[PDB]
């Protein structure tokens, strides 16, 4: 569930590239076992061990190898260390600053009728940001029988 | 949470501990990284005692 394969509408699928990189490595490893089982000439096992080394190296970083093995489309695969490093990795993006519930957005205006400590706020935006508090206040106030 | 593993039929070097520059494999043998690359890709044999 961290390299998901969620289904998309109409039968397409959305996979993460870690799935493709793992499948590459497993294919090449099983083929290497199938080669050692038949005891091929050392040329072929040497090539296969090179291929496995490259596959694991790409699964680890997908850099360091001149031409990072692109996906089906001609784009490079986001490797595992491309889920850590950089402005798009977990560190700078999903750990330090997160998308946050209880938060709206809207154009601002001037409103010079306001004391300094108070801000105008649309009825609809407060009714949305403040839904749980309203459910609690209603239920405790007996207006609403139950939460639904 | 669960994490399967993979028993590689052959060992294979960790790219992080090899191309971090300083190459940790490289100087942990005190051996230049060009020669490690000659050994890893089967281009040059290396003696082990």
């Amino acid at each position: 569930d961290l390299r998901p394969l969620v289904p998309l509408d109409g039968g397409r699928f959305a996979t993460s590239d870690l799935n493709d990189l793992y499948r590459r490595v497993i294919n090449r490893n099983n083929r290497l076992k199938r080669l050692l089982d038949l005891a091929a000439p050392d040329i072929i096992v040497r090539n296969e061990k090179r291929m496995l080394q490259e596959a694991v190296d790409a699964l680890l970083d997908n850099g360091r190898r001149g031409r990072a093995i692109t996906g089906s489309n001609k784009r490079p695969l986001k490797s595992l260390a491309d889920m850590i490093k950089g402005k798009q990795g977990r560190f700078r993006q999903n750990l330090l600053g997160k998308r946050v519930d209880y938060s709206g957005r809207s154009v601002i205006t001037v409103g010079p009728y306001l004391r300094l400590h108070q801000c105008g706020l649309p009825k609809k935006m407060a009714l949305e940001l403040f839904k749980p508090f309203i459910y609690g206040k209603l239920e405790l106030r007996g207006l609403a029988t139950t939460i639904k | 949470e669960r994490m399967g593993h993979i028993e590689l039929a052959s060992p294979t070097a960790h790219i992080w501990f090899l191309k971090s520059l300083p190459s940790r494999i490289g100087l942990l043998l005190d051996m230049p990284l060009r020669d490690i690359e000659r050994v890893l890709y089967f281009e040059s044999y290396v003696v082990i005692e």
Binding site: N47, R65, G66 | R34, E37, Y41, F42, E43
Partner: peptide
């Protein structure tokens, strides 16, 4: 005799 490369198809 050659310099180097990685390109496992090359080797």
């Amino acid at each position: 005799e050659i310099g180097r490369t990685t390109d496992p198809v090359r080797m």
